[PDB]
Amino acid sequence: AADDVNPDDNKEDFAVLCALAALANLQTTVPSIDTSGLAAYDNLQQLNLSLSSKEWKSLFNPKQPPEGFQSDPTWRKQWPIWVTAAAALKAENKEAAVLARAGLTNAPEELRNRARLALIPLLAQAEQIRDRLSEIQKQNEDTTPTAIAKALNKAVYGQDKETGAVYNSADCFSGNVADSTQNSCKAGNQASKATTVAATIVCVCHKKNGGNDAANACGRLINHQSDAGANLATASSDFGDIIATCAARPPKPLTAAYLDSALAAVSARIRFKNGNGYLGKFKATGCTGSASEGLCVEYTALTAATMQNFYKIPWVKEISNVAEALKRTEKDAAESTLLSTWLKASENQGNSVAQKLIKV
Numbered sequence: 567a568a569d570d571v572n573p574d575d576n577k578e579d580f581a582v583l584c585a586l587a588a589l590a591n592l593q594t595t596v597p598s599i600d601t602s603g604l605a606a607y608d609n610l611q612q613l614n615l616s617l618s619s620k621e622w623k624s625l626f627n628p629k630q631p632p633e634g635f636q637s638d639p640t641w642r643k644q645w646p647i648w649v650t651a652a653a654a655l656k657a658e659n660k661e662a663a664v665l666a667r668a669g670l671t672n673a674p675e676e677l678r679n680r681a682r683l684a685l686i687p688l689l690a691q692a693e694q695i696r697d698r699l700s701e702i703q704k705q706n707e708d709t710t711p712t713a714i715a716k717a718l719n720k721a722v723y724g725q726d727k728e729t730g731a732v733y734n735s736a737d738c739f740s741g742n743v744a745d746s747t748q749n750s751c752k753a754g755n756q757a758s759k760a761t762t763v764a765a766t767i768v769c770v771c772h773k774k775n776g777g778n779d780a781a782n783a784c785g786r787l788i789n790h791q792s793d794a795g796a797n798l799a800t801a802s803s804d805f806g807d808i809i810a811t812c813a814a815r816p817p818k819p820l821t822a823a824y825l826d827s828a829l830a831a832v833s834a835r836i837r838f839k840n841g842n843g844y845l846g847k848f849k850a851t852g853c854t855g856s857a858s859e860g861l862c863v864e865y866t867a868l869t870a871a872t873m874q875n876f877y878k879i880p881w882v883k884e885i886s887n888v889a890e891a892l893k894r895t896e897k898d899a900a901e902s903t904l905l906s907t908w909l910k911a912s913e914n915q916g917n918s919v920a921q922k923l924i925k926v
């Protein structure tokens with residue numbers, strides 16, 4: 567009976583599935599967009615405004631530019647930035663602190679004017695940097711620990727929640743379990759069912775009731791204290807025994823590379839026979855939990871040339887979406903470090919122009 571499903575026959579599949587299951591209820595840090603440069607740019611805006619004429623300052627003390635400028639593209643772009651700067655300078659002692667940092671406390675009118683003009687090229691250089699940093703901030707704002715946890719809890723348990731996700735067949739199998747194990751343990755088909763990591767573990771590892779089971783296929787250390795019932799009717803109790811043996815922890819912070827390597831590893835283990843793909847040992851008839859048949863997920867009609875469809879199965883899609891988001895955020899976080907360092911440097915440069923202008 568070496569060709570039947572025996573204890574340990576799905577042990578190596580189970581190690582990969584354990585790694586994936588450990589993405590449930592995850593508490594990870596995400597790469598941070600370093601937005602300290604936005605504050606540095608806002609300080610430069612405040613200096614520029616403080617040094618401006620009374621006629622210019624009068625424009626801010628409105629939701630839109632004044633008559634004549636409501637259609638000027640530069641005024642439309644800058645209005646909120648200017649308004650924020652004006653608002654921040656209303657705060658007690660703020661303008662005095664801004665001028666002091668710039669060397670401009672009690673500055674003569676001519677020096678205030680020459681200093682403001684000296685900021686023109688500096689601000690023009692910094693604008694493009696600040697706008698890229700603001701774009702990065704916006705583009706990555708949905709890449710958060712909470713959004714990742716929810717997506718991964720959909721992947722593992724079919725539950726769109728940040729924490730407290732647990733095995734429930736109503737969620738782990740699409741529409742709950744099917745009339746038969748064979749139909750429940752199919753994915754990608756018209757009647758796709760095994761659409762989460764947890765359902766995949768049930769199908770690859772469960773002990774069916776009624777004899778002729780493949781208990782301990784996923785490892786001899788599982789203590790199957792019950793069974794999954796007939797046709798997975800009571801899978802939850804058995805799943806709890808299986809998952810109790812899994813200790814996996816992903817690297818922290820979670821990376822795109824780690825998720826991509828996990829999906830690649832599964833892709834490398836799926837085997838094609840007679841027009842379907844299989845994860846877990848398949849002998850004949852279907853993925854039924856019976857030892858002489860199979861303990862597996864049947865990727866119905868999956869072939870090497872249609873493998874793109876594996877990436878559309880819910881759990882795979884959710885993990886893929888997390889990986890893609892992380893892939894962008896990792897790069898944009900590293901970019902933002904330098905954008906923010908550059909903008910802080912521009913702030914320091916702005917605070918130095920008065921010394922040059924005093925000396926001539």
Ligand SMILES: *[C@@H]1O[C@H](CO)[C@@H](O[C@@H]2O[C@H](CO)[C@@H](O[C@@H]3O[C@H](CO[C@H]4O[C@H](CO)[C@@H](O)[C@H](O)[C@@H]4O)[C@@H](O)[C@H](O[C@H]4O[C@H](CO)[C@@H](O)[C@H](O)[C@@H]4O[C@H]4O[C@H](CO)[C@@H](O)[C@H](O)[C@@H]4O)[C@@H]3O)[C@H](O)[C@H]2NC(C)=O)[C@H](O)[C@H]1NC(C)=O
Nearest residue numbers: 611614615617618619622635638639640641644682689690
């Ligand atoms: C730092 O703080 C200063 C203020 O101290 C602030 O300066 C102001 O910047 C704005 C935005 O660039 C300047 O707006 C221009 O205003 C002129 C008209 O100027 C008169 O009216 C204003 C408001 O009453 C007075 O402040 C000023 O002293 C003058 O009395 C407009 O003609 C400009 O429009 C052209 O440029 C825009 C910028 O790209 C275009 O969007 C627009 O379409 C216009 O360009 C077209 O027409 C041009 C003329 O024919 C042509 O040459 C172009 O190719 C194009 O075809 C613009 O609205 C304002 O004057 C500044 N005020 C002062 C006193 O300097 C800085 O903005 C602030 N720095 C930062 C980085 O925020």
Ligand SMILES: *[C@H]1O[C@H](CO)[C@@H](O)[C@H](O)[C@H]1O
Nearest residue numbers: 778779855856857858859
């Ligand atoms: C697993 O159970 C099925 C259904 O009873 C049986 O057909 C196989 O022979 C057994 O190994």
Ligand SMILES: *[C@H]1O[C@H](CO)[C@@H](O)[C@H](O)[C@H]1O
Nearest residue numbers: 567570778856857858859
């Ligand atoms: C299922 O059928 C195989 C032979 O095909 C047998 O070895 C198993 O014991 C039985 O359950």
